Amino acid sequence: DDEEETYRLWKIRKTIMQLCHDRGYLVTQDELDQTLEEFKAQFGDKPSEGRPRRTDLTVLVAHNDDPTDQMFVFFPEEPKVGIKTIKVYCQRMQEENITRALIVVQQGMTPSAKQSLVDMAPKYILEQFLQQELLINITEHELVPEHVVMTKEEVTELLARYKLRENQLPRIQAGDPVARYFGIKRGQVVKIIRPSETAGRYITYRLVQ
Amino acid sequence: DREVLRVIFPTGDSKVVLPCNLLRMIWNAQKIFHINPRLPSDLHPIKVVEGVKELSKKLVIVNGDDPLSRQAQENATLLFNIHLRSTLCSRRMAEEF
Amino acid sequence: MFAGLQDLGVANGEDLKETLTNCTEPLKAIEQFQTENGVLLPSLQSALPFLDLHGTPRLEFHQSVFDELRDKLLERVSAIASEGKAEERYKKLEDLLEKSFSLVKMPSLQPVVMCVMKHLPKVPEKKLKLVMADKELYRACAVEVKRQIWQDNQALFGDEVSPLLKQYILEKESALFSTELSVLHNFFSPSPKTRRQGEVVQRLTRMVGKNVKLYDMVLQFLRTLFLRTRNVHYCTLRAELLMSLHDLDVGEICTVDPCHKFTWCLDACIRERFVDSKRARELQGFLDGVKKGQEQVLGDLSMILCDPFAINTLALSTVRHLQELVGQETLPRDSPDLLLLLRLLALGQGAWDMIDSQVFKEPKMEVELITRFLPMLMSFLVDDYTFNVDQKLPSYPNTLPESFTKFLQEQRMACEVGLYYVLHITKQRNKNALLRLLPGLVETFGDLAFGDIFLHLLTGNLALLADEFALEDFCSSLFDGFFLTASPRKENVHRHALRLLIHLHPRVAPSKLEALQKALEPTGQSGEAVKELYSQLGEKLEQLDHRK
Amino acid sequence: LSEKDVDPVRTTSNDIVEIFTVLGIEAVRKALERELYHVISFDGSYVNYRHLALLCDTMTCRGHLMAITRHGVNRQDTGPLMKCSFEETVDVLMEA
Amino acid sequence: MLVIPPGLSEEEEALQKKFNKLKKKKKALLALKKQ
Structure with missing residues (x-):
């Protein structure tokens, strides 16, 4: 056709x-x-x-x-x-x-x-x-929350604020469909924004590994 | 805040789970001080506004003045603050309670 | 106060006076005159009594009608600005201005004319000159009108911007001299967008707006100030203003300027802190587009390239490609992009030379620079690598050729590249080559080694190397080889030395602490900032001695 | 999802592995939470959201779907002693 | 216009000699790492 x-x-x-x-x-x-x-x-x-x-x-x-x-x-x-x-x-x-x-x-x-x-x-x-x-376009699916790529400076600010090493953050693998969508490489941290039914809005972070 | 709720709560299910049962405590306040909801009261509405605003500062979940910390604290108690503002309204305190 | 109602045939206060003077019975004259002058609404005649029965004057009635209709006219003129085809709405606006400009001065009907001449694509120039004639109308003009009319009055714009120019210069000269020294938190640290977030930059963006004449006036002002003072902060102001105009995507200014894309790109270079092969390649491709009769733009292009941040970015890019060539064992002539950076830095540094000489032809480069300078610093880096290898292998030769010093003294490119590589290795904790190259820093081009840029960056780098400041040899060599040569006569050198001593005194040994204290007591021939820095140093050292 | 006249926003698949491979790790987390809620509240009972949230977050904390079996929690680097507390004690001891 | 002579300059030759020395030393170091 x-x-x-x-x-x-x-x-x-x-x-x-x-x-x-x-x-x-x-x-x-x-x-x-x-x-x-x-x-x-x-x-x-x-x-x-x-x-x-x-x-x-x-x-x-x-x-x-x-x-x-x-x-x-x-x-x-x-x-x-x-x-x-x-x-x-x-x-x-x-x-x-x-x-x-x-x-x-x-x-x-x-x-x-x-x-x-x-x-x-x-x-x-x-x-x-x-x-x-x-x-x-998978980012428009209802199951996929808001993904934002974080700059290095604000990653350092995060780590300083919560006083934790990068290996203690939750991980996301580079083969993730959203990770490939955003073209993010290892050692780079993604902010994730979700609507929560108990708090209203919850922000978590994921380290690419 | 109404629009924010509507994007957090599609399908319009208003049954939520929250710490303080505001309506029951309002009923308790009515019964303790013998309010008599029939005569005009002495409650300046700006007192209601300022009281809600200053209450919102004391309920801290994330402690700190960092912008990241402030954003986290605001997001943690967003739903409860919305409920508190929608209940302790100047008009609702002036005609219903 | 009826200046303009005479054009409409409206009887005015003088007519009222002459009727009252030539009156026989007051009722006739007053009643007839102001009732024919009154609002001719057929049903209005019944409304008049009811308004004044309570004693409320009908002036309140008329003023309420006036205010409601003023709200209505504002809304309708906004709708005209929004709705309607371009040609018909512009013609309507022109005719309505032509038949309503008689009452422009009156604050009562001022919003009518003001909104109309605000929404016109091009207000008639005779009316613009008439508006400029009256100071009140000029002050009441909207930002669009002020953009549209600021063509001839150059003294007024110059006087408006002169305090802004002074404050901008003071801000740029105070940020470099900030009390805190750090490599990552330095003068060049903020992004050009962040640098444009300042209130001065936003005020200047609002003032210049979309007008070509205003932009050219700013260009002439900045060019003349740079010519007079050799102050490179005007380059930063020009670049920031051009990028702020680019952020708004103003077609009437960006499109007419070939330099707007280059300035946007260069500020991006500053934001990225490097120039890759891509950046140098495209800057070359744009530079080579010198068409016939457009050589003057080169000078203005050099005006953009003389940005302190841009110069720092290009020189650090040169340093990074030099280190990359050391790692790759490859000559600079085998990487054309490094030579491209050298040419860009040459144009930036010779901005002032080309502006003063007015010769719009690209200055040439001596080849001895590339044939001897860069191989020499690459030899130094390879010597450091060989020392590292031999340390790992089961002394460091610090032989510095004097042509390094000669190139630094005579050549501007050698000056910039060598000074920035010194900065990079001082940040790199490369003590051996730092001591190797230190005696060559005594004299450079225009005291660029003693200039604000290099001195601030060197203080920031040494703040990282504060641990070496504990040892007497490091401090002695550094101070004697760099500062003590120019300490007694140069204010900036001594001020930077005072700042370094203040910020790195916790590590300095007590003997060296006291020696630097004795060497840094200012006399009466220094400025007040020197006295303030000395007072801070004394307070800090007294507090340290109290900790004993 | 690519078929025409099919909503690519609301269409789900009841399968956690397929959703993980197609949409990602946050999508699988949300879908897993919804599936647990459906299977528990089906009788009409109620379990507080905190417990489902914690279980789902532990299940998808490492970027890949961690099964609760021995093959999922013993591969996570949590220490030989609690690993032997769970299952195949002497095996993980010999490995360590 | 920028022009570069085809021949290798004095400091270029010295730098290339130091490249050769560093390369040989680093290859010997890698051979040691093999050992």
Whole structure:
């Protein structure tokens, strides 16, 4: 089909825009809430054997606070990404001066690709994202409370206030869907805001490990 | 505070669990001092306002003046403070109690 | 007081006087004259008695109607500002101003004209000049109108901002000299957004607003002050004002300025405390966009790059890439971004030179700098690494070439880079290379080693190295090699020495404590701040001696 | 959840492991609390929220679903003696 | 315009020699860590 593919591409694009907005990257208001119709009109309404193909709607976004912190979002064509595709993506990012990529695969990439991706991490950080995980925005689910990423200074302020070491905080693993949504790395602390039926509102903290 | 409750309590279930049974203590106060809820009383409403405000400062759960500490203290007794304000209203103290 | 009702044909107080003078029977004249002048409401004639039956004057009635209709006119003019198509609503506003400006001075109908000329996209210039003619109308103008009209009057704006300029300079010169010294809590510690959170910055953002002429006036003022005084705080003011305008996303100012993006980026650099390959690369890409006839902007661009915070950020970035090259065993010429930082620092430091000389051509760099200076400090760092290795292996050679001192004395880039690497290694507790490079700090470019930036950062770093202050050798070497050379004539050096002695006296040995006390007793030729610092030092040391 | 005309906000799944893998550790905590409340208040009784909250917080304190069995609480680093107090005493003693 | 000579300068050569010495010492140290 082509109509369902158009719907899928629009949906994943919308979720990527929301994710970039959540991380603090500068996403304009108009493209954040562009409905299906303008997407169809501007990209092509015919992904199958048509101009709205992949690698055409890849997006670079710059950080709102810092103009020189940017992220590519790529949509590879081959269902199973191999070493060649991530290698050419590395090459493309090489002439650019940016170090952050967001891959949206259609099926799980090859184990060699994952191993190279995790070996590449210290200089060039990039993540994979199955398109199935992107058809919905999980932070809008009622079960997922408010997640906020905490700066290092306020983490130190927390630790000083409660006089506890970082290993005594509750933990969250980097493989968590919300953790991957916010792209947080180890040693980084997340504030969590919940509505409580006994207090009214409860704030807890989680250390990424 | 009404809007805050409505976003904490969807489906409109007002049965909550709280420390002090305010209505029963109001009834006790009415019966101890022989209030006679038929004659006009001598209770300046600003006394009600200031009394609620100064009571809210004494019920401390998180102790400290740090902004983090103040936020934690405010969040800990948010629900009870909402209930206290919704009960000890100047109008409710002026026409019902 | 009816200046303007003569244009509408409204009979005025003079007409009342002449009718009362040429009157035969008062009832006729007064009644007819003010009843034709009264509110022509058909049903109003029945309301008049009932108002005054209790004795309540009908003036209260008319004033109540006036106030209610004033509320209504304010709401309706706000609705005009909100609703209606642009062309029709602008034309309506223009016509309504044209037929209502006759009563602009009257405080009764002032809100009408004030809101109308507030909501106009472009108020007629003749009426703007007339408003500027009357001080009351000028003071009553809204912020939008004041933005719209502040074009010709430059003396008034200069006088308005001069106390703000003075207070800003005093704040920037007092933050550097703060009684508390620390590396993390220093002058450059607050983010540019936090630096703009000040009341002065918000007042200046409100004052400048969206007007191009006001922005250019501020640019000229700051350029002239920087030219006269060589005070780099004007650079920080210009950058903060430009970023505060950027935060509002004012199109009429940001779009016309190519430097607004650069200033936003540079303040981001300051916020991140570093310049990576990305930052230097994009700053190069923007700098190379010098089109024909736009070379003057370079000077103004240099005006942005002469920010003390920006200079600190670029020099610390140079230090970090130098350490990275030491770790990587790679030359600076194999990393173009370090040379990019050097060029950026050169433009920032030569901002004043290019502004004074008015030559809008990029100054050139001598190659001996890169061929000898940076390899020398990298040799020092490699020597420290070799000492560490040989310590682990089952002495540290501190041979300092004098061309280090020569480069620091003559070259501005060598001065900045060497001073910042000294700061970094003093923060790093790198005692050996600190003693190695200390005799080279006696003379630098324009006493940048004795300047406020480096002296504050050095005091902050030594506050971390207070433990070494217990030993006599460390304090003796540091003081004799840096402070005692410029102590008797330079106020800033002696003030920084006094602050360091105050803040690090718990560790200093009693012999060195007393030696520094004798070396730091000010005479009558020093300022009052010196006396205050001496009084604080005496109190602290007396309290310490009381603990015995 | 990705199907059209399906609410992606209110749709739950009664399964804690699936919710953990899809939505995260806080979502599984809230869902686990709701499931315990449903299974306990089904008879019409009442147990104070503090006890469910404490149980759920201990169950999901380490970022992964900690089962209350020996495989969940003995793998947590709490000391050989209380571990042998629970189960497989001599085994954990030999390991220690 | 910035121009850099193709040849290696005096201090560059000394720095590269010290790079070589530090590299050899650190490789010997790592071999010791192997032992």
